[PDB]
């Protein structure tokens, strides 16, 4: 009986959405979105995906079940994007890939698999990290611990506090890493720091799990993958949960993958069978549509070329707005220095505003931001930059 069931907490982000929609003030700006938006303030379906879809419409002859691990080409294509077209992991057949319901579904199947087939008890999440991370791992029965990441003073990665924090993790603990475009600081380890991280991980015996949801949004498709690749060249085992929601704009089609890398082919195949058992007891097999779309774009020269151009366009816009933001705030005049905004990657970053300030920005100006000061750079258009920066200057 559910007569005494207690209501789940209203998730903060969902809340802002309803408060903003109900905001009668015509000059309102929503910077707590979580999705990409163009200069127009819209999240269109990519031209390359629309072409891929017309194609599927013309050529699909059946809607019959996919295998537990999804469409094969899709799996192969993602392994190449993650590790490189000619990696030893691919040639030596050390990795297996399951197509899953988004990047979140990939984290939950990893979690379920880890929980029932291994002795892992804790997962180390960065502080701060994407809030749903904790909920996924806790739901599978794993304990979540946090390692230090952000440096509130300097707006940077506290690498000392980072390596110092992880010394509390024992061999066999999983350590969660954001491949690029750290949600929500936008702060990423540099290559030197990734190599230092990869080496230390091997030494202490961490099981690295990578959350790779923004490949292509920081510097490029291959550039963004070198941190993961620095760990892959050094570990016998690792798991990578990837998403295509943002880089393909396929949010609601739920397309991602869970990649298991083992010491060798024989062992990865044996572990993957248990990962497939984990999937069968959850959703059975994955949704074909969005994954089919990804597989036909990546497998076609013309379509892939158009998609890559559409991805660089999004990446550049997000980089344009970070610059515009920093200096439009300067032209508004105030002891500040939001220049650190320029060094961060992706759509998110902490503005450095207090909850005191974020609250009045909203009530007094109708500029919506997350209580943590998180601001989505894609919510900014060259049109709303001045009226945005003026609101920020007034609360400083």
Ligand X SMILES: *Cc1c(COP(=O)(O)O)cnc(C)c1O
Q: Is residue 290 near a second copy by the rule CB under 8 A?
A: yes
Q: Is 130 annotated as a binding residue?
A: yes
Nearest to 12 by CA among 372, 381, 298: 372
Number of neighbouring beta carbons within 10 Å of residue 206: 25
Task: Please say which residue, 95 or 279, places its beta carbon nearer to ligand X.
Answer: 279
Residues 231-270 that bind ligand X (CB under 6 A): 243, 245, 256
Q: Is residue 139 near a second copy by the rule CB under 8 A?
A: yes
From residue 142 to residue 181, the character string flagging contacts with a second copy as x (rule: CB under 8 A) and all else as - is ------------------------------x---------
| Residue 8, binding choice from a second copy, ligand X, none, Cβ under 5 to 8 Å by partner class | a second copy
Least distance between ligand X and beta carbon 86 (Å): 27
Least distance between ligand X and beta carbon 106 (Å): 8
Are the C-beta atoms of 84 and 222 separated by less than 8 Å? yes
Helices 47-59 and 288-298 pack at an angle, to 10 degrees, of: 110
Q: Which of 82, 209, 250, 311 binds a second copy (CB under 8 A)?
A: 250
**How far is Cα 148 from Cα 125, in angstroms, rounded to an integer?**
9
Task: Please say which residue, 130 or 307, places its beta carbon nearer to ligand X.
Answer: 130
Are the C-beta atoms of 69 and 309 separated by less than 8 Å? no
Q: Is residue 104 near ligand X by the rule CB under 6 A?
A: yes
Within 8 A by CB and 6+ apart from 284, the residues are: 65, 68
Least distance between ligand X and beta carbon 147 (Å): 16
Q: Is 96 annotated as a binding residue?
A: no
Q: Is 183 annotated as a binding residue?
A: yes
Tell me the three state secondary structure of residue 373. coil
**How far is Cα 51 from Cα 294, in angstroms, rounded to an integer?**
11
Task: Please say which residue, 118 or 284, places its beta carbon nearer to ligand X.
Answer: 284
**How far is Cα 288 from Cα 304, in angstroms, rounded to an integer?**
19
Q: How deeply is 156 buried, as exposed, middle or buried, from its count of CB atoms within 10 A (0-12, 13-18, 19+)?
A: middle
Q: Which of 70, 75, 103, 286 binds ligand X (CB under 6 A)?
A: 103
Least distance between ligand X and beta carbon 283 (Å): 7
**How far is Cα 156 from Cα 185, in angstroms, rounded to an integer?**
9
Q: Which residues pair with 151 in a beta bridge?
A: 156
Kindly indicate which of the ranges 39-47, 49-57, 98-106, 149-157 contains the residues binding ligand X, using the contact rule CB under 6 A: 98-106
Q: Which of 99, 183, 247, 345 binds ligand X (CB under 6 A)?
A: 183
Q: Which of 102, 186, 366, 379 binds ligand X (CB under 6 A)?
A: 102
Q: Is residue 39 near a second copy by the rule CB under 8 A?
A: no
Four-residue CA torsion sign, 27, 31, 33, 36: positive
Are the C-beta atoms of 341 and 312 separated by less than 8 Å? no
Please give the annotated binding residues for L-aspartate, written as ranges: 34, 130, 183, 374
Q: Which residues bind ligand X (CB under 6 A)?
A: 102-104, 130, 178, 183, 211, 213, 243, 245, 256, 284
């Amino acid at each position: 009986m559910f007569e005494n069931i207690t209501a789940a907490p209203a998730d903060p982000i969902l809340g802002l959405a309803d408060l903003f929609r109900a905001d009668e003030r015509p000059g309102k700006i929503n910077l707590g979105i979580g999705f990409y938006k163009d200069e127009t303030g819209k999240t269109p379906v990519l031209t390359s995906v629309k072409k891929a879809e017309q194609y599927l419409l013309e050529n699909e002859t059946t809607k019959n079940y996919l295998g537990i691990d999804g469409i094969p080409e899709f799996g192969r294509c993602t392994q190449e994007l993650l590790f490189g077209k000619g990696s030893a992991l691919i040639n030596d057949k050390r990795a297996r890939t399951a197509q899953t319901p988004g990047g979140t579904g990939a984290l939950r199947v990893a979690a379920d698999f880890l929980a029932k087939n291994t002795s892992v008890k804790r997962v180390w999440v960065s502080n701060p990290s994407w809030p749903n991370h904790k909920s996924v791992f806790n739901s599978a029965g794993l304990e979540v611990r946090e390692y230090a990441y952000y440096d509130a003073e300097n707006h940077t990665l506290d690498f000392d506090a980072l390596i110092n924090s992880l010394n509390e993790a024992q061999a066999g603990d999983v350590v969660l890493f954001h491949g690029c475009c750290h949600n929500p600081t936008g702060i990423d380890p540099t290559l030197e720091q990734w190599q230092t991280l990869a080496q230390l991980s091997v030494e202490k015996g961490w099981l690295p799990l990578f959350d790779f949801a923004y490949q292509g949004f920081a510097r490029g498709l291959e550039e963004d993958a070198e941190g993961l690749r620095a760990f892959a060249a050094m570990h016998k085992e690792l798991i990578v949960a990837s998403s295509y929601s943002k880089n393909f704009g396929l949010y609601n089609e739920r397309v991602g993958a869970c990649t298991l890398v083992a010491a060798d082919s024989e062992t990865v195949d044996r572990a993957f069978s248990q990962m497939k058992a984990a999937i069968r007891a959850n959703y059975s097999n994955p949704p074909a549509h969005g994954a089919s779309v990804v597989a036909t774009i990546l497998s076609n020269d013309a379509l892939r070329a158009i998609w890559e151009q559409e991805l660089t366009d999004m990446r550049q816009r997000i980089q344009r707005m970070r610059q515009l933001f920093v200096n439009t705030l300067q032209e508004k005049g105030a002891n500040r220095d939001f220049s650190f905004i320029i060094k961060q990657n992706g759509m998110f970053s902490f503005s450095g505003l207090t909850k005191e300030q974020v609250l009045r920005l909203r009530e007094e100006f109708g500029v919506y931001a997350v209580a943590s000061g998180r601001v989505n750079v894609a919510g900014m258009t060259p049109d709303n930059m001045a009226p945005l920066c003026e609101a920020i200057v007034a609360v400083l």
